[PDB]
Amino acid sequence: LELRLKSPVGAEPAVYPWPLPVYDKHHDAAHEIIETIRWVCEEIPDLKLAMENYVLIDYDTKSFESMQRLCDKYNRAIDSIHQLWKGNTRPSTGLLRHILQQVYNHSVTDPEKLNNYEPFSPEVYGETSFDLVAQMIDEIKMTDDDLFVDLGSGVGQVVLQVAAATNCKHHYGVEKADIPAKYAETMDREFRKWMKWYGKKHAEYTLERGDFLSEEWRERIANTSVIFVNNFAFGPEVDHQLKERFANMKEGGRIVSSKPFAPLNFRINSRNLSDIGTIMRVVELSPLKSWTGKPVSYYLHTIDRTILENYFSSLKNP
Numbered sequence: 001l002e003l004r005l006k007s008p009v010g011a012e013p014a015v016y017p018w019p020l021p022v023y024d025k026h027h028d029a030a031h032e033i034i035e036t037i038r039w040v041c042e043e044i045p046d047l048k049l050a051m052e053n054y055v056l057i058d059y060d061t062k063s064f065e066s067m068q069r070l071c072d073k074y075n076r077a078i079d080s081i082h083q084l085w086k087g088n089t090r091p092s093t094g095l096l097r098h099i100l101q102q103v104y105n106h107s108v109t110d111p112e113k114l115n116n117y118e119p120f121s122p123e124v125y126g127e128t129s130f131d132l133v134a135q136m137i138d139e140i141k142m143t144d145d146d147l148f149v150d151l152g153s154g155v156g157q158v159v160l161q162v163a164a165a166t167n168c169k170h171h172y173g174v175e176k177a178d179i180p181a182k183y184a185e186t187m188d189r190e191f192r193k194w195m196k197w198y199g200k201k202h203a204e205y206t207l208e209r210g211d212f213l214s215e216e217w218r219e220r221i222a223n224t225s226v227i228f229v230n231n232f233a234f235g236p237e238v239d240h241q242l243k244e245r246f247a248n249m250k251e252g253g254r255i256v257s258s259k260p261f262a263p264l265n266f267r268i269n270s271r272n273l274s275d276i277g278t279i280m281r282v283v284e285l286s287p288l289k290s291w292t293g294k295p296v297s298y299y300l301h302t303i304d305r306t307i308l309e310n311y312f313s314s315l316k317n318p
């Protein structure tokens with residue numbers, strides 16, 4: 001009582017039990033199977049030739065026999081292609097969206113347990129966050145010298161997306177809450193397994209449980225080159241403590257957030273020398289400035305102590 005999908009790169013097969021797991025009101029494992037097959041067919045043109053036309057539309061998700069026949073036809077077509085080949089790149093954006101959703105559906109079995117009613121919740125990642133994170137990746141252009149940290153990483157979705165798209169030395173996700181941090185452990189295993197199944201490359205990453213406001217995390221923030229933080233619902237105290245942590249970052253250190261940490265129009269004077277605006281540039285970025293999603297904006301902060309230095313030089317030399 002199971003369905004098996006052979007890996008296009010010879011990794012362990014994907015095994016699903018029957019009856020197939022139900023994900024949410026509108027998605028299930030049956031549709032994930034058909035979409036997986038269709039993605040592999042795009043990835044391998046020979047496979048599309050080896051597979052008969054009708055097979056990827058003439059199926060019945062409510063029938064074991066029909067689902068088994070679909071799986072069989074794909075498995076046999078993958079077998080002939082492996083026969084032809086007898087004789088590790090980053091995933092495309094479309095495949096990655098599919099992989100992240102697949103990883104989530106296999107990891108977060110109980111969605112009520114998450115208790116996230118907020119916008120940008122793990123449950124709606126594909127609809128809201130995925131495209132926005134992709135636009136953010138294109139805008140900040142990270143290299144192998146960069147270290148990326150998502151402060152309050154939930155189930156680790158942003159970290160997985162960034163690790164699958166960039167060549168940062170390392171990507172970290174830190175989450176305090178027990179339930180998301182526990183789900184993140186499964187997300188991590190499911191992501192590595194599925195990426196191996198597709199034969200797709202990703203950078204090194206770590207998902208960990210912890211408080212980003214802890215003593216251990218003070219020096220970790222100071223050594224981070226790119227911080228991602230959804231500070232939208234942060235209270236003044238968490239916001240205050242975070243600014244203190246950012247104050248130890250290196251020149252050129254960057255912070256990508258949902259609310260700015262300093263005003264966009266900050267003008268250094270004698271009365272505001274204690275403000276974070278004295279040591280960081282801030283710009284409002286928006287995909288609307290070929291975006292067709294929500295009219296969102298995000299904030300890029302760049303550590304630059306010359307703001308403070310130029311002010312002191314202006315006072316000594318008028």
Ligand SMILES: COc1nc(N)nc(Nc2cc(S(N)(=O)=O)ccc2N[C@@H](c2cccc3c2OC(F)(F)O3)c2ncccc2Cl)n1
Binds near residue numbers: 298
């Ligand atoms: C508006 O309602 C709302 N409620 C809550 N709780 N959080 C937010 N957050 C929020 C608000 C706005 S805004 N400025 O248009 O109001 C815009 C974006 C977010 N969140 C984004 C996010 C946060 C930080 C840096 C970002 C970012 O996206 C980025 F990639 F561009 O760089 C998000 N967060 C968590 C996971 C995935 C994603 Cl993608 N928004």
